[PDB]
């Protein structure tokens, strides 16, 4: 009884360790087991009903280090269990899942701007690297469609990117797709109805509120209704046919308003507010 939206970690004056869940049907908010380590800039995904916390940059009383950690949360036990860590720390990471395999895309290790991606086999609890991206990307958004991994926007070390690349697992290669109309760093990327949505983000001069979706059929970026709040480093997921944007940062305050986008109406609604404003959260639904 209840498929939930999960928010894990985040930042607000100090990277948080909170794990909270939102039930859209009734609007309730749930406080669950906190992360063993406060983390922000991490990404979230679910494989086999299990929630995974990947990457980010964790708080410590002995430093503020880029985390290569992979942690697994079981809603049934409300208990976090650490898994095998990634080869290298990845902060500002994008993660996409293909057949129960977790793809870690880009991310930063201090000044190192990763272009390498590694995949995780949950059953073996092992990470193995694959082909690296054509471009270095941190703050990149990752989305999987028809068993294809799309990495969009980000920062390559000197430029904020509007380009996107596509990973073909069968060929194990990266192909550059038509770039977005807008440069987006720390934007929200998700898939809905054969379309990759890029929501919000940072273009280099100001946090964005516009949203443009990429139509796989045409392979072209088209603008849709923009969001009511400008946000960057936002959490994003789709839940029962609607896109959900969680929190983010507008350039002034750490936001918490959650906005819902309806494809059929092409309108944004503020469905709820979170317990506390936060940014750089990982988001997943299960
Ligand atoms: C110091 O103030 C803070 C503002 C936000 C946070 S945060 O917790 O949200 N956070 C986590 C972390 N730092 O690891 C993040 C911060 C910035 C990001 N960008 C980098 C990129 N595009 O490469 S950004 O483009 O969104 C951007 C650029 C400039 C401004 N002014 C704001 C945002 C992130 C991208 C992805 C994930 C997390 C990000 C913490 C402190």
Swiss-Prot record:
Result of altering residue 41 to C: In a lung adenocarcinoma cell line; also in NSCLC cell lines; strongly reduces interaction with NFE2L2/NRF2 and reduces repression of NFE2L2/NRF2-dependent gene expression
The Kelch repeat ranges on this chain: 4-49, 50-100, 101-147, 148-194, 195-241, 242-286
Domain of life from the UniProt record: Eukaryota
Listed transmembrane segments: none
Modification sites for S-cGMP-cysteine: 111
Family of this protein: Belongs to the KEAP1 family.
Protein name: Kelch-like ECH-associated protein 1
Organism (species): Homo sapiens (Human)
Gene behind this protein: KEAP1
């Amino acid at each position: 009884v209840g498929r939930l939206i999960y928010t894990a970690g985040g930042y607000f004056r100090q990277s948080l360790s909170y794990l909270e869940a939102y039930n859209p049907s009734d609007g309730t908010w749930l406080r669950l087991a906190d992360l063993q380590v406060p983390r922000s800039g991490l990404a979230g995904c679910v494989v086999g009903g299990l929630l995974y916390a990947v990457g980010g940059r964790n708080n410590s009383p002995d430093g503020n280090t880029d985390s290569s950690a992979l942690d697994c949360y079981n809603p049934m036990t409300n208990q976090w269990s650490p898994c095998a860590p990634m080869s290298v720390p990845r902060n500002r990471i994008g993660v996409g899942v293909i057949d129960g395999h977790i793809y870690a895309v880009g991310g930063s290790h201090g000044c190192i701007h990763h272009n390498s991606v590694e995949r995780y086999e949950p059953e073996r609890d092992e990470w193995h690297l694959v082909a690296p991206m054509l471009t270095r990307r941190i703050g990149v958004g990752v989305a999987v469609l028809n068993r294809l991994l799309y990495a969009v926007g980000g920062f390559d070390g000197t430029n904020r990117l509007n380009s996107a690349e596509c990973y073909y697992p069968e060929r194990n290669e990266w192909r550059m797709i038509t770039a977005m109309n807008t440069i987006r760093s720390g934007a929200g990327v998700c898939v809905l109805h054969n379309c990759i949505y890029a929501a919000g983000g940072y273009d280099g001069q100001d946090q964005l509120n516009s949203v443009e979706r990429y139509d796989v059929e045409t392979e072209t970026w088209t603008f849709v209704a923009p969001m009511k709040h400008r946000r960057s480093a936002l959490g994003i997921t789709v839940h029962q046919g609607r896109i959900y944007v969680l929190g983010g940062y507008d350039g002034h305050t750490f936001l918490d308003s959650v906005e819902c986008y309806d494809p059929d109406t092409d309108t944004w609604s503020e469905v709820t507010r979170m317990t506390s404003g936060r940014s750089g959260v990982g988001v997943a639904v299960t």
